[PDB]
Amino acid sequence: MIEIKDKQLTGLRFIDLFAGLGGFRLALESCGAECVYSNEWDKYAQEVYEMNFGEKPEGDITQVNEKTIPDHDILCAGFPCQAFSISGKQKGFEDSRGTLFFDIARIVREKKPKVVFMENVKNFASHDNGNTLEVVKNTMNELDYSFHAKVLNALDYGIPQKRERIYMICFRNDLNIQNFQFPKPFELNTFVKDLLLPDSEVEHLVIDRKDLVMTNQEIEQTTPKTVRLGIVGKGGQGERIYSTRGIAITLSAYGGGIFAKTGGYLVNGKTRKLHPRECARVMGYPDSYKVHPSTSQAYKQFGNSVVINVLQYIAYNIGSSLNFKPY
DNA sequence: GATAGCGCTATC
DNA sequence: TGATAGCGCTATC
Ligand SMILES: Nc1ncnc2c1ncn2[C@@H]1O[C@H](CSCC[C@H](N)C(=O)O)[C@@H](O)[C@H]1O
């Protein structure tokens, strides 16, 4: 993450829905805002959230009386992405886990926060011939909110990871917010190799397999792209190896494969998966962040987390727009 | 709950 | 196209 000195969000209060690891919290908190509520049903997710913030999130959002939610100014939610990701059976709203947005909508209707800040996968945009995005657009407008959305890739914001997500910022119609903008991209100066751990700490993640085929050769030049080097087995998800000289492929939560959830990387002549801490780093988490004790749950957690640095920039801008009230 | 081999879609 | 990436799905212990 980065340091912000013009804490544009100082007096505001926010809600951390689908908290997970708290990526949103870290993000807004660094801009001066204060988290007044958190929600997360996963036992293991609750444990890390507590380890790091001292709070234990409330349970299943579905059975929560919206009125019970504290007055808040910003609503943060990176709702479930399985039903929309290019990686699954795209059942969308028909999927048992595709309706959460509507819960967001009921919370919005009742609480009327100044800002709604959501995050989802890139395919959310194209899904069902854009009909899903549309339902989300109209619903929002209908509740009296402007709807701004853009697909941003983390590699354009200082993090060596290809993670194209769609960000939806909605402003209550009152405040004539006509000056909001998404952060301007910038050259990538940090690559995977820069975030790795000393070999001593990683020895146990090394995986030597015989069906390890090598398609391309290691590169000499650093590049802001996922340069694949090899494949293992049939080369499906989790069995593809990348160069630590490019950028990390997207980390996943339920991903399988021998290089389960992080993909594999050629580190100093050896083939291995990323260590939880490295995932944290690749998501822009500070090294002070305490990872969950079960590596399986740590990988899952980071798999569906959010790239902090990006949210920071966006949060800052959200701040700037709200603070421009000239005479 | 932890592990891993899958088989499909979007994108150009 | 033909080759790549994808906050995944699901069967086994
Ligand atoms: N009905 C529900 N109630 C509460 N939390 C829920 C839920 N359905 C899914 N979740 C939680 O939704 C989360 C989505 S992942 C989003 C993670 C968050 N942005 C962070 O930065 O890490 C998961 O933790 C999942 O357990």
Phi then psi dihedrals of residue A229, to 5 deg? -115, -40
Indicate which technique resolved this structure. Answer: X-ray
Breaks (C-N over 2.5 A) in chain A follow: none
Owner of token pair 């959501």: A118
Q: What residue's CA is closest to ligand 1, atom 5? A: A40
Helix A43-53 vs helix A295-303: crossing angle, to nearest 10: 90
Q: Are strands A264-267 and A270-273 parallel, antiparallel or unpaired?
A: antiparallel
Residue A266 pairs in a beta bridge with A243, A271
Q: Are A14 and A34 in contact (CB under 8 A)?
A: yes
How many residues appear in chain A?
327
Q: Which amino acid is at A134?
A: E
CA of A5 to C1' of C10 (A): 47
- Ligand 1 pocket by Cβ (under 6 Å): A 18-21, 23-24, 39-42, 45, 60-62, 78, 80, 304-306
DSSP structural state of residue A287: T
Q: H or E element: which one contains A77? A: strand A74-77
Q: Are strands A240-243 and A228-232 parallel, antiparallel or unpaired?
A: antiparallel
CA of A312 to C1' of B10 (A): 29
Phi then psi dihedrals of residue A279, to 5 deg? -60, -45
Q: Are A295 and A301 in contact (CB under 8 A)?
A: no
Is A78 (CB) below 7 Å from strand C? yes
CA distances from A23 to A18, A320, A326 (A): 10, 21, 32
Quick one: which atom of ligand 1 is closest to the CA of A304? 15
**Residue A81 is among the residues annotated as catalytic for this protein:** yes
At CA A282, angle to CA A280 and CA A285, rounded to 5?
40
Q: Are A45 and A20 in contact (CB under 8 A)?
A: yes
Look up the protein residue whose alpha carbon has the minimum distance to the C1' of B10. Answer: A86
CA of A129 to C1' of B11 (A): 15
Domains present along chain A, CATH in parentheses:
1-186+285-327 (3.40.50.150), 187-284 (3.90.120.10)
Residue A118 pairs in a beta bridge with A77, A168
Closest by CA to A74, choosing from A27, A28, A19, A120, is: A28
Is A256 (CB) below 7 Å from strand C? yes
Q: What residue's CA is closest to ligand 1, atom 17? A: A20
Give nucleotides in strand B with any atom < 7 A to a protein C-beta.
1-11
The reported resolution of this PDB entry, expressed in Å, is 2.6
How many angstroms is it from A218 CA to the middle of ligand 1?
38
Residue A38 pairs in a beta bridge with A16
Q: Name every residue whose Cβ is closer than 8 Å to that of residue A54 and which is 6 or more positions away in sequence.
A: none
Starting at the earlier edge strand, list the strands of the sheet with A74-77: A34-38, A13-17, A74-77, A115-121, A164-172, A145-153
DSSP structural state of residue A154: G
Q: Are A138 and A116 in contact (CB under 8 A)?
A: no
Q: Which amino acid is at A159?
A: I
In whole angstroms, what is the distance from residue A263 CA to residue A240 CA? 6
Residue A214 pairs in a beta bridge with A230
Owner of token pair 């790239």: A307
How many angstroms is it from A136 CA to the middle of ligand 1?
19
Residues having Cβ less than 7 A from any atom in strand B: A 86-87, 90, 123, 126, 233-234, 236-239, 254-258, 260, 294-297
Closest by CA to A232, choosing from A205, A271, A199, is: A271
Look up the protein residue whose alpha carbon has the minimum distance to the C1' of C5. Answer: A249
A17, A29, A41: residue to mutate for ligand 1 pocket, most atoms within 8 A of CB: A41
How many angstroms is it from A37 CA to the middle of ligand 1?
14
Q: Which two tokens stand for residue A104?
A: 């967001």
In whole angstroms, what is the distance from residue A130 CA to residue A138 CA? 12
Dihedral sign from CA coordinates of A132, A174, A167, A284: negative
Q: Which of A31, A35, A76, A81 is catalytic?
A: A81
Q: Are A79 and A87 in contact (CB under 8 A)?
A: no
Q: Which two tokens stand for residue A54?
A: 């001292």
Starting at the earlier edge strand, list the strands of the sheet with A212-214: A212-214, A228-232, A240-243, A264-267, A270-273
Residue A166 pairs in a beta bridge with A120, A151
Q: H or E element: which one contains A150? A: strand A145-153
Would you call A117 helix, strand, or coil by DSSP? strand
Nucleotide nearest to A43 (CA to C1'): B1
CA distances from A196 to A180, A205, A244 (A): 36, 13, 9
At CA A76, angle to CA A31 and CA A9, rounded to 5?
20
Would you call A196 helix, strand, or coil by DSSP? coil
Is A121 (CB) below 7 Å from strand C? yes
For residue A103, with 0-12 CB atoms within 10 Å meaning exposed, 13-18 middle and 19 or more buried, which class applies?
buried
SS3 content of chain A, % helix, strand, coil (to 5): 30, 20, 50
Quick one: which atom of ligand 1 is closest to the CA of A97? 8
DSSP structural state of residue A250: P
Q: What residue's CA is closest to ligand 1, atom 12? A: A18
Q: Are A145 and A116 in contact (CB under 8 A)?
A: yes
Query: Whole-angstrom distance between the N-terminal and C-terminal Cα of chain A?
Result: 35
Closest by CA to A85, choosing from A154, A23, A155, A132, is: A132
Query: What is the three-state SS of A20-74?
Result: CCCHHHHHHHCCCCEEEEEECCCHHHHHHHHHHHCCCCECCHHHCCHHHCCCCCE
